[PDB]
Design a protein around this ligand. Structure first.
Ligand SMILES: Nc1ncnc2c1ncn2[C@@H]1O[C@H](COP(=O)(O)OP(=O)(O)OP(=O)(O)O)[C@@H](O)[C@H]1O
Length: 311
DNA sequence: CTCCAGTACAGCGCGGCTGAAATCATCATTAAAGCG
């Protein structure tokens, strides 16, 4: 098995230009906010499985590895909002995250704000990052709760720490609720999936950078004339499912004697990870499924919005 | 301060009533054909 090759095949990262555009903007946000005056407050979108958490873990690596190895400073922070977040609920988890506090046996929402606003200059927080903004909409109706939104405006105007919010593409109507939240968050971006399969894409260079990143030491055989056809036939532009199927083929090749990912084990990888796909999506690998041109069609605009049509 | 209970307020769903539209009855009127 040689589990080093397995973990080294799973932990692989390809920097598409949108990702480095993002990380450049967050360093821009980090040492552009001067902690004297009003911050910049970027907002990042992206659908399910487009690489968001990988982006922020890249960011806390390249921004906080040496400063977390040096001492208890914690300049950048990483937060997910729990579902249907009460303002005291999000505030207390954001508080027990940073520092070494006890911090949550009292739930009073004024005095823990006191403790968090005295601690946010005490350890020297350079940036606060929130992962999951779509948790503030109701399940069965599309009312949105902005107790946490006005609380986040309060902690923004209290201490001038920059905030970078990630979230689903349907989570922006929450920002359409509070207009002061809408104006305070100026930079919204678009981390949409891979666009086309027609040729000379960013998809190409991503694919062959992943190919040299793979643990097989000669060639992976991928990013070819017909392979990206069935690859884009399998995953829409969907980064998580593409990488998942690729990893599930790579483990199958390293289970036995195999020199590269080839045409006997990539099929069984299509057999496993075909579960999340819809019924009208077509299964292209086993016996005779040639792929029409309409099925490599680019992803629509409401690609991170199908959590929202039904209600 | 937190959990449980009571009680108010708000919301959704179901049922009943009312209104409108569609269909069927019902006959009435008009026209054509046959008989006187
Ligand atoms: N730049 C990249 N290069 C290689 N693989 C990547 C890249 N970005 C993401 N992946 C793969 O995609 C998978 C999904 O990553 P991630 O969870 O960050 O997406 P996401 O949009 O945050 O999904 P969710 O929002 O549901 O957490 C990861 O397992 C990772 O291996």
């Amino acid at each position: 098995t040689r589990e080093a090759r397995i973990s080294r095949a799973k932990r692989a990262f390809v920097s598409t230009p949108s990702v480095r555009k993002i990380l450049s903007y967050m360093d821009r946000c980090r040492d552009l906010s001067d902690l004297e005056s009003e911050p910049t407050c970027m907002m990042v979108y992206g659908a399910s499985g487009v690489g968001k958490t990988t982006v922020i873990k890249k960011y806390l690596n390249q921004a906080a590895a040496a400063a977390a190895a040096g001492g208890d400073i914690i300049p950048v922070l990483h937060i997910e909002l729990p579902d249907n977040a009460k303002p005291v609920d999000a505030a207390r988890e954001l508080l027990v995250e940073m520092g070494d506090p006890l911090a949550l046996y009292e739930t009073d929402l004024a005095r823990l704000t006191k403790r968090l606003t005295e601690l946010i200059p005490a350890v020297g927080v350079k940036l606060i990052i929130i992962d999951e903004f779509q948790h503030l909409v109701e399940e069965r109706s599309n009312r949105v709760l902005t107790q946490v939104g006005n609380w986040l405006k309060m902690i923004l105007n209290k201490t001038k720490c920059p905030i970078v919010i990630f979230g689903m593409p349907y989570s922006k109507v929450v920002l359409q609720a509070n207009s002061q939240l809408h104006g305070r968050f100026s930079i919204q971006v678009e981390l949409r999936p891979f666009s086309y399969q027609g040729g000379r894409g960013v998809f190409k260079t991503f694919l062959e950078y992943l190919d040299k990143a793979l643990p097989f030491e000669k060639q992976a055989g991928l990013a070819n004339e017909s392979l990206q056809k069935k690859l884009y036939a399998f995953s829409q532009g969907n980064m998580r499912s593409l990488r998942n199927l690729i990893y599930q083929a790579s483990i199958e090749a390293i289970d036995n004697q195999h020199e590269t990912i080839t045409e006997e084990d990539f099929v069984f990888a299509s057999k496993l990870t075909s579960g999340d796909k819809p019924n009208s999506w077509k299964n292209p690998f086993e016996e005779g499924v040639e792929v029409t041109e309409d099925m490599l069609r680019p992803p629509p605009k409401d690609i991170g919005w199908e959590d929202y049509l039904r209600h």
